[PDB]
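In the laboratory, one determines a bound structure by crystallizing the protein with its ligand and collecting diffraction data. In a computational setting the workflow is compressed into a single prediction: the sequence and the ligand go in, and a structural description comes out. We illustrate the idea with 2E1.
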Amino acid sequence: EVETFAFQAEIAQLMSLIINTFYSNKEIFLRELISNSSDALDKIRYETLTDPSKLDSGKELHINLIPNKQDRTLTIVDTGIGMTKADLINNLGTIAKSGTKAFMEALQAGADISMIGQFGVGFYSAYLVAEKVTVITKHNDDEQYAWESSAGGSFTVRTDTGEPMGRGTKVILHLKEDQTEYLEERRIKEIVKKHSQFIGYPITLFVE
Ligand SMILES: CCNC(=O)c1n[nH]c(-c2cc(Cl)c(O)cc2O)c1N1CCNCC1
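The predicted complex, in structure-token form:
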């Protein structure tokens, strides 16, 4: 059923640095998420170039944004390659330990946090606005899993006999009391227009 994993020390440190460092420009989280989705869609597209069956689990490659003012979530869905359980345990497909190192040094030499994605650990910026992050993922070569954490040095993984998804990744953000602007139509379109206007895949913003 539910396995529990400790973050490597370095991720745990990045996460804490992200949660505590005073830093106003929290909007970038959306850009790192959308850009992760796009990377993952590149990958299923690439793979399909040589094997068309790769797309049997769905041929539309797209990114939806789904706010929910009632649950206080913002969900980013994509029809990318997805991750296996191994990928979810191994820092969500990232090279997060070396990447946290280069980010740490960079930060001490005058990066700011908005530059997190140049170090390959953009996922973690989700913790700028979310108290808890659940990732659901289905890869063609594995079953559906949900990865979850509220930081604090640990994460969980479990099989998701929830809503089958076909193929993709779904990042539900459970937003902090004071970051509900990220749930407003007006405010999301603005961030997508500003940081994510040249993404090679349709982005749909759902309405409620
Ligand atoms: C090994 C093949 N799978 C993937 O690469 C993958 N599948 N889904 C994602 C993904 C990860 C995050 Cl954090 C996200 O917000 C969206 C994604 O699609 C993936 N990424 C995106 C790039 N960083 C590594 C994990």
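The longest helix spans residues 28-48. Keep in mind that any predicted model is a hypothesis to be tested, not a measurement.
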